[PDB]
Amino acid sequence: LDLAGPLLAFLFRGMFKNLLKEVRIYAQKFIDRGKDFNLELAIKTRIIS
Amino acid sequence: GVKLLDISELDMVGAG
């Protein structure tokens, strides 16, 4: 019986995967520009929320 | 385990 716990864990997996994909895209974009990315702007917080 | 933060340790970065 998947309760709130396993269920929310299942969602949080995909959402954290998507967050890591987003910061990968942002960091690759700014690294290929030759300059350091700001980590705090790389995170799109609205994915999880 | 996940730590708890008190409300006084929340910096006002969410406003900036």
């Binding site: 929310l8 910061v23 990968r24 960091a27 | 996940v2 340790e9 929340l10 969410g14």
Partner: protein, 87 residues
């Protein structure tokens, strides 16, 4: 879920590796929650009560922070490890 499974989902995530060359590593280590708070239009945190959430059509939610270690190597055989606390 909150106390254990979230921290495990973060810990078992593979660290992020980026190139152009300048190598960049990202690793998430520790997880933090505060009590459910609310920032008004002034951006001022305040403890949000569930009755307020029912009444004002808010979401009884707690912000989530993570400690992140970025380890950048500029192919000079040196690693700069900068840590952002409570991101």
């Amino acid at each position: 879920f909150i106390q254990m499974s979230v921290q495990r989902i973060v810990e078992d995530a593979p660290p992020i590796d980026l190139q152009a060359p300048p190598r960049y590593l990202l690793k998430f280590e520790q997880i933090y929650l505060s009590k459910p708070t609310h920032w008004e239009r002034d951006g001022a945190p305040s403890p949000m009560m569930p009755n307020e959430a029912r009444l004002r059509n808010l979401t009884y939610s707690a912000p989530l922070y993570v400690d992140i270690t970025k380890t950048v190597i500029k192919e000079g055989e040196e690693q700069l490890q900068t840590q952002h606390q409570k991101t």
